[PDB]
Amino acid sequence: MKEIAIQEKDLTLQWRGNTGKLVKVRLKNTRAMEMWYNKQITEENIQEITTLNIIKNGKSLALEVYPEKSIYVKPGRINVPVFFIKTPINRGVFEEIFG
Amino acid sequence: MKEIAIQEKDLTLQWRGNTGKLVKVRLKNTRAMEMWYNKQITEENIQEITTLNIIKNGKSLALEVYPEKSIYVKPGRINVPVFFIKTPINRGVFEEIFG
Amino acid sequence: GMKEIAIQEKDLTLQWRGNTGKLVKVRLKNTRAMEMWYNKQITEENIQEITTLNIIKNGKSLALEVYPEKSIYVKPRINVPVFFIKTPINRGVFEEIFG
Amino acid sequence: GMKEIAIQEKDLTLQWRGNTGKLVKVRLKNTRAMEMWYNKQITEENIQEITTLNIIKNGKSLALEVYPEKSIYVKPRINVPVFFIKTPINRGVFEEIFG
């Protein structure tokens, strides 16, 4: 287990059908640049993460990912990390949590 | 020397007179929460940072800080890191850089 | 007869049944409501003349009929206009349109 | 004589001389301009009737005279209104007002 918290405002969320299951989350370009400088997530360490703790509106939601599926996608200038979400969660409850 | 990059959108900037010198930068509450979970900056490690690399609009600007002055301020729910900026930079040139 | 007013989506708080279902009502944001108050763009006397809201966003437009007899001002300094949506539209298709 | 229109600050791109000096001109953002186009709120035929913009933000308001004979549409899909500010105001005091 390795958990990283990421504020929701830094993620582009892909919901199946726009309203269904959360399929994947992609880091925004600016936050990705920042992480590159800091080595916060790297191509070499990305698959160590098993949980994303999504932060927003003073609330937090831990979501397991499929670590074998985590990848960098182009780009922007540099590639951005993408996580495939394993814990089932749908858009309605996600919106309810974060308000 | 220890440098940390932080995207501008996560900082509340205090400009002397609103237009003059950058005096200090305060992390936003949500990013502060995220950093708390990750231990990215902590009360124990904050004074190790000598440079902030401010990221925005695909651009980057390194600014030295006064490490002895870096502190947590309340709050929000938890305290937030504050850096006092040593490198002189005024609002006009900062705006020019970041556009 | 018909009276249509366009409002940019960013000026609306949208209420979706169950967060993902039918669009039930939209409420103007506080800043925009104050602007409309100074301009008399929408007023207590005229709000019920509006039969259609043309929602604008991302260079796209979606006309939606309202129930004019349900249009009301609600408490926020300034009360704000609320419209009850008559044209059936769900969150998925709305997100599809506007992206 | 006088004709005054309120516009929420978030719908304006403000041009400050030297980024920190006098406010020279404001241009409507693209989304708001498209809305105003559908509503005929401001039009090529009427734009030069406006003598004062009432800038709205953070529950506050600031009236600024314009040079009506300088008000023009510029290329962005849709051309957008631009006003040249006559009332002298600088970035510091403007930021002070609105915070």
Side-chain angles (χ1 to χ4, degrees), chain D residues 17-36:
Chain D
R17 192 96 65 194
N19 299 319
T20 58
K22 192 172 188 298
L23 178 55
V24 167
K25 67 169 98 169
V26 308
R27 167 193 166 121
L28 267 290
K29 275 180 176 144
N30 294 9
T31 301
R32 185 58 184 282
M34 186 69 82
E35 195 213 80
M36 295 183 155

Side-chain angles (χ1 to χ4, degrees), chain D residues 42-64:
Chain D
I42 303 173
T43 63
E44 235 133 333
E45 179 54 294
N46 78 14
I47 184 176
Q48 291 202 336
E49 309 197 357
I50 292 154
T51 61
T52 303
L53 302 187
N54 189 14
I55 298 173
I56 309 308
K57 172 169 181 174
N58 286 346
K60 291 218 172 143
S61 66
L62 187 46
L64 294 172

Side-chain angles (χ1 to χ4, degrees), chain A residues 3-7 9-10 28 30-31 33-34 37-38 40 53 55-60, chain B residues 3-7 9-10 28 30-31 33-34 37-38 40 53 55-60:
Chain A
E3 181 172 324
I4 182 164
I6 301 175
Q7 42 182 12
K9 56 172 50 169
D10 284 343
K28 300 188 150 137
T30 304
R31 188 50 186 290
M33 177 164 151
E34 195 212 78
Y37 280 115
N38 289 331
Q40 185 171 19
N53 185 11
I55 306 311
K56 173 168 178 177
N57 293 346
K59 302 227 200 151
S60 66
Chain B
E3 181 172 324
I4 182 164
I6 301 175
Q7 42 182 12
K9 56 172 50 169
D10 284 343
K28 300 188 150 137
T30 304
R31 188 50 186 290
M33 177 164 151
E34 195 212 78
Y37 280 115
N38 289 331
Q40 185 171 19
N53 185 11
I55 306 311
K56 173 168 178 177
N57 293 346
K59 302 227 200 151
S60 66

Side-chain angles (χ1 to χ4, degrees), chain D residues 63-76 78:
Chain D
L64 294 172
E65 308 186 287
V66 305
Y67 293 112
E69 315 298 314
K70 299 188 192 153
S71 303
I72 58 164
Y73 279 71
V74 301
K75 183 147 183 250
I78 187 206

Side-chain angles (χ1 to χ4, degrees), chain A residues 43-76 78:
Chain A
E43 229 145 301
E44 179 64 307
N45 81 12
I46 188 168
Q47 297 203 334
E48 314 186 349
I49 288 156
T50 59
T51 307
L52 299 192
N53 185 11
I54 302 175
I55 306 311
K56 173 168 178 177
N57 293 346
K59 302 227 200 151
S60 66
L61 180 58
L63 296 175
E64 293 185 288
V65 305
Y66 294 106
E68 355 73 73
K69 296 192 200 171
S70 306
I71 53 152
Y72 283 71
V73 180
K74 74 203 106 174
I78 293 287

